[PDB]
């Protein structure tokens, strides 16, 4: 679907494209690694609000 | 009255706080400066984050004469 | 930026050595120099505010 859907934001853009790039190497992972940035940018959320420099956590 | 005797007082203050022990110290950015001298590079001696404050405090030891320069008009 | 806040600890103390009216100028100045590692001691992570405070010590 984000490929016939029509990404409105350079967030989405690499999402559809991540997916993709998962895809393109093999089929799973792929609807899944779309939610896991997001869930992991949700897991750094508030810590890039909390105190936290992310490049600690990202590392 | 609110002129001599408050003068008279604030002499029978400090005339108490020599006469006591007699300490002849000098202001007027004389102390202010030095005192900062000392503190402001005394204040990179102690690698803590307070150097900060300790370094920016120096120069409010220099502050109140910086006031009596203009205050004297220079 | 070592020798940005390196040098940042000297010339205030050097500024300070010359009085003048630009002796709090050059110290401001001298001063400058901490900043750009505090970004960088800020952008790579954690705590520029003490990264700093004692290396310039």
Known sequence: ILKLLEVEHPAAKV???????????????????????????????????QKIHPTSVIS | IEEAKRSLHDALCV????IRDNRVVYGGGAAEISCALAVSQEADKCPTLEQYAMRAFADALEVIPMALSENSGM | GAPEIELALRL??????????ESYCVRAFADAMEVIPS?????????????????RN
Request: aromatic share 2%; with cysteine.
């Open chain 3, 39 to 55: 970004t960088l001691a800020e952008n790579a992570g954690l705590n520029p505010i003490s990264t700093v405070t004692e290396l």
């Open chain 2, 15 to 18: 005339i108490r706080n020599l």
């Open chain 1, 15 to 49: 999402l559809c494209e991540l997916a993709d790039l998962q895809d393109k190497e093999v089929g799973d992972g792929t609807t899944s690694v779309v939610i896991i940035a997001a869930e992991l940018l949700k897991n750094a959320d508030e810590l890039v609000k």
């Open chain 3, 12 to 21: 205030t103390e050097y500024s300070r050595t010359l009085s003048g009216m």
